[PDB]
Symmetry: D2
Subunit: 257 residues, 4 copies
Amino acid sequence: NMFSLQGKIALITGASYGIGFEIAKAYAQAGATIVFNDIKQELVDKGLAAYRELGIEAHGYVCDVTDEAGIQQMVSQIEDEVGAIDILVNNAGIIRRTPMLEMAAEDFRQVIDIDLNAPFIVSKAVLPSMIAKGHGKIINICSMMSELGRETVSAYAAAKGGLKMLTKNIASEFGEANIQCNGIGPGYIATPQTAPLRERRHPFDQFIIAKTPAARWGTTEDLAGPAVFLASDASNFVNGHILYVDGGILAYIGKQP
Amino acid sequence: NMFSLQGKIALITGASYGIGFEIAKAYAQAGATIVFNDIKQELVDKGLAAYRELGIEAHGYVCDVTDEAGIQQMVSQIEDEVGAIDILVNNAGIIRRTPMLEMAAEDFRQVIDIDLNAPFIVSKAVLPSMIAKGHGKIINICSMMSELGRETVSAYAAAKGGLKMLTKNIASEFGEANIQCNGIGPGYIATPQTAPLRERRHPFDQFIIAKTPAARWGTTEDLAGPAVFLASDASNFVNGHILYVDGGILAYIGKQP
Amino acid sequence: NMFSLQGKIALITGASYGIGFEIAKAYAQAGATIVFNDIKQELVDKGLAAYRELGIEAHGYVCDVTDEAGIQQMVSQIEDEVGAIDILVNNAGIIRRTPMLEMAAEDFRQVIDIDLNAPFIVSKAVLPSMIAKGHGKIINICSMMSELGRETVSAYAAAKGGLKMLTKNIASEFGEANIQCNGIGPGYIATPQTAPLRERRHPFDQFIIAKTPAARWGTTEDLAGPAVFLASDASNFVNGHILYVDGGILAYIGKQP
Amino acid sequence: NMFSLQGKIALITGASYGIGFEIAKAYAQAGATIVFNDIKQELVDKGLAAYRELGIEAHGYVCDVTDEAGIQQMVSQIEDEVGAIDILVNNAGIIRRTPMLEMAAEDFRQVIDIDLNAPFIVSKAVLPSMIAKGHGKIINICSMMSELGRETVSAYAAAKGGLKMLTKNIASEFGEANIQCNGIGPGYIATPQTAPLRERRHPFDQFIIAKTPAARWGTTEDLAGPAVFLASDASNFVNGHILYVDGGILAYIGKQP
């Protein structure tokens, strides 16, 4: 009922694989029509194949999220071919891990441009049709780094701190037009790329368990409920809110000896 | 599916009427078995009648939430008659509006005892069985006053600020036993008791609209999705988190002239 | 100049020893007249002797901070003997470390009463004269536990979370009368009572260093500047603010392997 | 004593006029040697003249804060001519007020580049010498918009939200080298540019008073104490902290009718 996404169209940026692709799966299972983009045709093609393998009829487009003219054209095409976008998930992103004193300004700027400026560009592009149709959701994928810092991730933390405030600002500016803009802030989600950090007692695995009241890594399934919730009519009075999905990390001082 | 409360038993304290009764309705619609208490039989009886009128078979008990011995006995009885409690919503509360310099220490203490100490008492009472059965949810009804102050509500703000940290602490301490403890923080919810403040352009109504990006008062239905979400298996990696349901108030500096 | 406390009278509750006594030293060095209380004459007497040994002419009174009638009488006596109180530091407190399921409600309530209700009582008692004289400062000693939870400190975290909101509320309610109410939130301060936790590489010492960007325990001298700052005319537009003095703990995700 | 800046060199970016120039005045009065930059010689020249008129011997350089190569050269020159920089205040900034749907991506990007990327560039440039000499302060001028959103200031809020996390990250990454990186977050500071908004009862003036417990606009003098505090040895264990100087705005739900 209120948690259903039946009839709704969702654009999840960068959802050819990874967390975005998993959110798309959940959205599809909730009844949503799936639209996504990536920066090259090869990724879009492989993504579409992967969606087909799961029985999901997705719609994939090649576009750089930092390219405003391109994104505007993409949204127009989506409107022609699928329909007006009800839900935007700004998921596309990069991370760099570089000691700040060693990080080239060009690289800092790139992280900011993809992770902060691009969500503005894509939000701006989808908003007119959301406003016109009378309801819209914009969900920004934030981070623990929207709240806490760490050596080597200065650009990423700056971007994610910014993305948190862009969320609150979009909520503020467009709330009156029945737009709800919120964040999802994943904790440590176990993915194949970090499998060596969990090989059997691993120091890093221990660090994560000790930081986490839930005493485990998160999963992509852990993000499905929170993501569908924020995309659904069940959260229509949740606005400008960052929903952290972290097993309690941000609530806990940590497991001490 | 993941948002279903089928088979789950929920204790909502003070749910003979008001916001708690509305949360119970939503929980019942989601499949939950409803249990509640209030401080006198007259309220419990009327509450049960109201639940019956809606086709809800609730279970009502007379207990003061500040009475630990009583609450322990109540929980034991609920276990006998209904089953082990899967979900606790600490909803029972009072508000006093008194200028701080005019507030008797006894009255400040009463607000704290009902709104802060009692949620500890009831949480403590339900936790052993949640831990033993392998999953539990504790949802504390917080407030805008968990974050922001106002003249005349010093005791209430102190209590709700405390309740926010009790939430984070329970999450921290019991997370490893698969307990998720979270908060719901309603904004301004329109109820019959504040109907005169919305009579037609009303100054107070204008103050609320100007503070709120959504440009409206909240409803009890606005709380149903957030409450079911936090009670459900869909939020199993959300822990120690206060979910504000306020149309964006806490995100917004306000509508200026 | 603006950081001077010359001519100002400061009441620091519980300052017969410990962090409060160290704050009093700093205040004395900044020019303040020192007033304090404790619950028994023996502590007040020893405190006064310790102040005299440092060349500080303090004024000590026997009063339980939870005893409103007593505190009202104490404040009246201070006004007679020293002058109207310009600065209140709510420092008196207890900590209990008890697993929540093992904590008697009486003990939870005691922590709340001393650490949360009493700062209200003492604030209420000093405010009329601050308002009448045209300026006042109230500084509440908060904690990392005003933000983060941990196993065994549920009552303390609830109290300190509450104290943070009492701070914001007093700021809100009395700001217009030129009262500034703010918090100081110490991190891990090294004191003789925790000397065994730093004996030489100690696991706990390592846990603290790893949590702290500054890579050290805090000192009481670390709190002197922040405390004098908030007591001084240099912070007259800082209000409702918790100033954390923690070497960066609350800003940092932690040192990972 | 601990609040003194005697012997210390402070770079305040953009301090040819405005809030930065006022912070520089306070720093000079506290004993600091003043260094500043601006983007054109005309501003640097006029700034230096204004400093001379007050008896302050400042050192002015022409540099764009977004120009990394230029900033690196400027810092090297400052080291030659004045000495190693002890304190950096990232003050240079712009604000644009544009409805988000009407804001060109180039303009959004410019706000981000000056207000977020540039503080990274300048921080990076001063850090090696701070680390080598054994102590440094970096103070980032944040905003109410580091926490709250408003229509028309999406780029500015995104930048200031980012700047808050850059602060916490620098604190995290460089804390161990005795760098303290903190924020100052001014509220509504009355400046000549907003004089029409205070002409006599003005609607906007009323909006500000109603939002502010202190019941007044802030002044630049209100920022002097907080700024000197964070630049001084009195705040050596304050790190990763945003010090809001707002008369209580962020603590208060607002004055209701």
